[PDB]
């Protein structure tokens, strides 16, 4: 069977269903009457009826909103028959790809991270790792592409930015010098994770840094 | 033959050739090895070589720029053979749609239009028409949606805007009162037409209005 170039349908559609996607038909329909149908998971097997096809015209339709994060892709088969029951084409394998949107917010693996730095440590040294996940499509979009930032430091001393976060790795490093356990022994950072490479949906967690001797 | 939904390729592509459009497989290639070719005008028929298919992968490719205004649609057929050159699928009908770019400036039907009006005529009274054409796709885009403007009036008396042009139709009308043949017996307007509804490519021409008793 040929495999159709994929038919895209974005997730979370609203309004009137069903909606037309694409017309799939046989160029033999002037030689004999052609009746169309589709089978497979999403047509006549679970989930039944998400897609339906017009029996005489071959208009493929979707009957409800989709969620890429539940099902990313459907495989079905179209069929062309004539009155006498002969198949007028081999089946075609129909591929339908659910096209992503940014409908998922990043999430930190924990609501509080804990680390230790040694007070005499060099601007460069690695303190700790923070971690988020996005459920969206990390292959075809930036909707799951996470920029880690530091939003705030407490206390703001000796300097405001004692610390640096690598925006891709979520690794927290020492930016700056004057780090003394006995002046200021614990810092509480508010860290942000935002998708769209930093520009999109965001969430915050806390990172608690204990200064050591 | 199944006829696949059409594949869009914009005119006036730039850079590296060939470029990939779509992957056209058969799913009988787990079993033995399948070889692809294409025929049709645009492939093995004139214009020869605009599209090719990579024999082993089935990537359909475009080999040079297209121009919608010369050819807007191609029809190709793909074929699937085994090493002995025997068909393992019926052919598949491939439709290619060339999509529009705004690569055509509107042209006024004439370089100078002539019209005339009675000095008595009341504001709102209709004088003459100006007219432009645009060669871009006036069915699916705004690349031919022309808006009309008066750029200048000569002379600027008794007042600067004796006239008005409806931006959608090109009808020139009397805007303000005071027309009088024996003070100013003709006006020369520069008129402008622009696509994208005024926002796009532009051209100008002249309209000459003879004030009559
Ligand atoms: Ca979703
Ligand atoms: Ca997201
Ligand atoms: Ca999503
Ligand atoms: Ca100390
Ligand atoms: Ca063109
Ligand atoms: Ca064009
Ligand atoms: Ca145009
Ligand atoms: Ca007079």
CB contact under 8 A, A1 and B26: yes
Torsion of CA B117, B123, B124, B129, to 10 degrees: 30
Nearest to B92 by CA among B47, B32, B43: B43
Please tell me the distance from the alpha carbon of residue A75 to that of residue A63, in angstroms, as a whole number. Answer: 16
Please tell me the distance from the alpha carbon of residue A153 to that of residue A48, in angstroms, as a whole number. Answer: 53
For the domain covering B3-101, report its CATH number. 2.60.40.60
* DSSP code for B137: -
Please tell me the distance from the alpha carbon of residue A66 to that of residue A48, in angstroms, as a whole number. Answer: 13
Chain A nearest-CA residue for B4: A24
Chain A nearest-CA residue for B8: A5
Question: A92: which chain B residues are within 8 Å (Cβ-Cβ)?
Answer: 2
Q: How many CA atoms lie within 13 A of A50 on its CB side?
A: 19
Residues 6+ apart with CB under 8 A from A103: A11, A12, A69, A136
Please tell me the distance from the alpha carbon of residue A104 to that of residue A138, in angstroms, as a whole number. Answer: 12
C-alpha of A72 from chain center: 10
CB contact under 8 A, A89 and B22: no
Q: Show the CA angle centred on residue B178, arms to residues B175 and B181, nearest 5°.
A: 110
Check: CB of residue B107 under 8 Å from CB of residue B81.
Answer: no
H helix or E strand, kind and range, residue B117: strand B112-118
Residues 6+ apart with CB under 8 A from A74: A40, A41, A42, A50, A51, A94, A95, A96, A98
CB contact under 8 A, B4 and A1: no
Nearest to A141 by CA among A86, A176, A103, A172: A103
| Annotated binding-site members of B for Ca(2+) | 103, 134
Domain A102-213 top-level CATH class: mainly beta
> Exposure string (b/e) for B192-213, b if CB count within 10 Å is 16 or more?
bbbbbebebbbbebbbebebee
Helix (H, G, I), strand (E, B) or coil at A118: strand
Nearest to B122 by CA among B207, B161, B179: B179
Interface subset of B 67-96, CB within 8 angstroms of A: 78, 80, 89-90, 92-93
Q: Could you tell me if residue B12 is left (phi over 0), alpha (psi between -120 and 50 degrees) or otherwise beta? A: left
Q: What is the token pair recorded at B115?
A: 């019209």
Please tell me the distance from the alpha carbon of residue A43 to that of residue A47, in angstroms, as a whole number. Answer: 7
C-alpha of A148 from chain center: 17
Burial class (CB within 10 angstroms; exposed 0-12, middle 13-18, buried 19+) of B143: buried
Chain B nearest-CA residue for A60: B5
Question: A89: which chain B residues are within 8 Å (Cβ-Cβ)?
Answer: 1-2, 90
Nearest to A75 by CA among A57, A63, A91, A56: A91
Residue B70 alpha carbon to ligand 7 centre in Å: 15
Nearest to B187 by CA among B212, B207, B164, B158: B207
Helix (H, G, I), strand (E, B) or coil at B59: strand
Q: What is the residue-wise DSSP string for A7-74?
A: EEEESS--SSSSEEEEE-EETTTTTS--EEEEEEBTTTBSSTTSEEE-TTT-EEEE-S---TTT-SEE
Please tell me the distance from the alpha carbon of residue A163 to that of residue B179, in angstroms, as a whole number. Answer: 77
Please tell me the distance from the alpha carbon of residue A143 to that of residue A148, in angstroms, as a whole number. Answer: 14
List C-alpha distances in Å: B106 to A46, A76, B204.
54, 47, 9
Chain B nearest-CA residue for A92: B2
> What ligand is nearest to the CA atom of residue A121?
4
Check: CB of residue A151 under 8 Å from CB of residue A201.
Answer: no
Residue B177 alpha carbon to ligand 8 centre in Å: 12
Please tell me the distance from the alpha carbon of residue B96 to that of residue A3, in angstroms, as a whole number. Answer: 17
Please tell me the distance from the alpha carbon of residue B33 to that of residue B26, in angstroms, as a whole number. Answer: 10
Please tell me the distance from the alpha carbon of residue A90 to that of residue B13, in angstroms, as a whole number. Answer: 36
Residue A96 alpha carbon to ligand 1 centre in Å: 16
Question: B28: which chain A residues are within 8 Å (Cβ-Cβ)?
Answer: 1
Please tell me the distance from the alpha carbon of residue B49 to that of residue B62, in angstroms, as a whole number. Answer: 9
Please tell me the distance from the alpha carbon of residue B174 to that of residue B128, in angstroms, as a whole number. Answer: 10
User: Does A1 touch chain B if contact means CB atoms closer than 8 Å?
Assistant: yes
Burial class (CB within 10 angstroms; exposed 0-12, middle 13-18, buried 19+) of A190: middle
User: Does B23 touch chain A if contact means CB atoms closer than 8 Å?
Assistant: yes
Check: CB of residue A25 under 8 Å from CB of residue A4.
Answer: no
Residue B121 alpha carbon to ligand 8 centre in Å: 12
How much helix, strand and coil, in percent to the nearest 5, is found in chain B?
Answer: 0, 45, 55
Please tell me the distance from the alpha carbon of residue B88 to that of residue B44, in angstroms, as a whole number. Answer: 21
Check: CB of residue B18 under 8 Å from CB of residue A41.
Answer: no
* DSSP code for B45: B
Distance from CA of A68 to the nearest CA of B (A): 22
CB neighbours (10 Å) of residue B82?
15
Question: B90: which chain A residues are within 8 Å (Cβ-Cβ)?
Answer: 89-90
Helix (H, G, I), strand (E, B) or coil at A166: coil
Please tell me the distance from the alpha carbon of residue B159 to that of residue B209, in angstroms, as a whole number. Answer: 15
Q: What is the token pair recorded at A26?
A: 């046989």
Q: How many CA atoms lie within 13 A of A37 on its CB side?
A: 9
Q: What is the token pair recorded at A8?
A: 């895209």
Please tell me the distance from the alpha carbon of residue B56 to that of residue A169, in angstroms, as a whole number. Answer: 40
Burial class (CB within 10 angstroms; exposed 0-12, middle 13-18, buried 19+) of A184: middle
CB contact under 8 A, A1 and B90: no
> What ligand is nearest to the CA atom of residue B106?
7
* DSSP code for B11: S
Check: CB of residue B180 under 8 Å from CB of residue B119.
Answer: yes
Q: What is the token pair recorded at B83?
A: 């090493």
Q: How many CB pairs under 8 A join A and B?
A: 51
The residues spanned by each domain of chain A are 3-101, 102-213
**Elucidation method:** X-ray
Residue A149 alpha carbon to ligand 4 centre in Å: 28
Q: What is the token pair recorded at A179?
A: 């780090």
Q: What is the residue-wise DSSP string for A177-196?
A: S---TTT--EEEEEEEEESG
Helix (H, G, I), strand (E, B) or coil at A200: coil
Distance from CA of B58 to the nearest CA of A (A): 11
List C-alpha distances in Å: A193 to A83, A113, A130.
60, 14, 10
Torsion of CA A161, A167, A171, A176, to 10 degrees: -20
| Annotated binding-site members of A for Ca(2+) | 103, 134
The β-bridge relationship of strands B92-99 and B7-10 is: parallel
Helix (H, G, I), strand (E, B) or coil at A197: helix
Please tell me the distance from the alpha carbon of residue B194 to that of residue B143, in angstroms, as a whole number. Answer: 10
List C-alpha distances in Å: B212 to B130, B148, B160, B199.
20, 25, 19, 36
The partner residue sitting opposite B24, judged by closest CB among A5, A27, A78, is A5
Q: Show the CA angle centred on residue A166, arms to residues A131 and A125, nearest 5°.
A: 105
Please tell me the distance from the alpha carbon of residue B10 to that of residue B8, in angstroms, as a whole number. Answer: 7
Q: How many CA atoms lie within 13 A of B97 on its CB side?
A: 10
Please tell me the distance from the alpha carbon of residue A5 to that of residue A209, in angstroms, as a whole number. Answer: 52
The β-bridge relationship of strands A202-212 and A112-118 is: parallel
User: Does B46 touch chain A if contact means CB atoms closer than 8 Å?
Assistant: no
User: Does A157 touch chain B if contact means CB atoms closer than 8 Å?
Assistant: no
List C-alpha distances in Å: A166 to A11, A106, B80, B114, B132.
32, 17, 50, 70, 57
Residue A196 alpha carbon to ligand 3 centre in Å: 12
Task: Match 């927290």 to its residue by tokens.
Answer: A172
Please tell me the distance from the alpha carbon of residue A102 to that of residue A120, in angstroms, as a whole number. Answer: 43
């Amino acid at each position: 069977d040929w495999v159709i170039p994929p038919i895209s349908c974005p997730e979370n559609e609203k309004g009137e269903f069903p909606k037309n996607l694409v017309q799939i038909k046989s160029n033999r329909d002037k030689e004999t009457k052609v009746f169309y149908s589709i089978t497979g998971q999403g047509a006549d097997k679970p989930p039944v009826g998400v897609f339906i096809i017009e029996r005489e015209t071959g208009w493929l339709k979707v009957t409800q909103p989709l969620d890429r994060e539940a099902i990313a892709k459907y495989i079905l088969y179209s069929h062309a028959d004539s009155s006498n029951g002969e198949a007028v084409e081999d089946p075609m394998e129909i591929v339908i790809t659910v096209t992503d949107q940014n409908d998922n917010r990043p999430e930190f693996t924990q609501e509080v991270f804990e680390g230790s730095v040694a007070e005499g440590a060099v601007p460069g040294t690695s303190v700790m790792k923070v971690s988020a996940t996005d459920a969206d499509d990390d292959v075809n979009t930036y909707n799951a592409a996470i920029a880690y930032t530091i939003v705030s430091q407490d206390p703001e001393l000796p300097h405001k930015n004692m610390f640096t976060v690598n925006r891709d790795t979520g690794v927290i490093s020492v930016l700056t010098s004057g780090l003394d356990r006995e002046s200021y022994p614990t810092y509480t950072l508010v860290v942000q994770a935002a998708d769209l490479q930093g520009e999109g949906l965001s969430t915050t967690a806390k990172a608690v840094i204990t200064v050591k001797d």
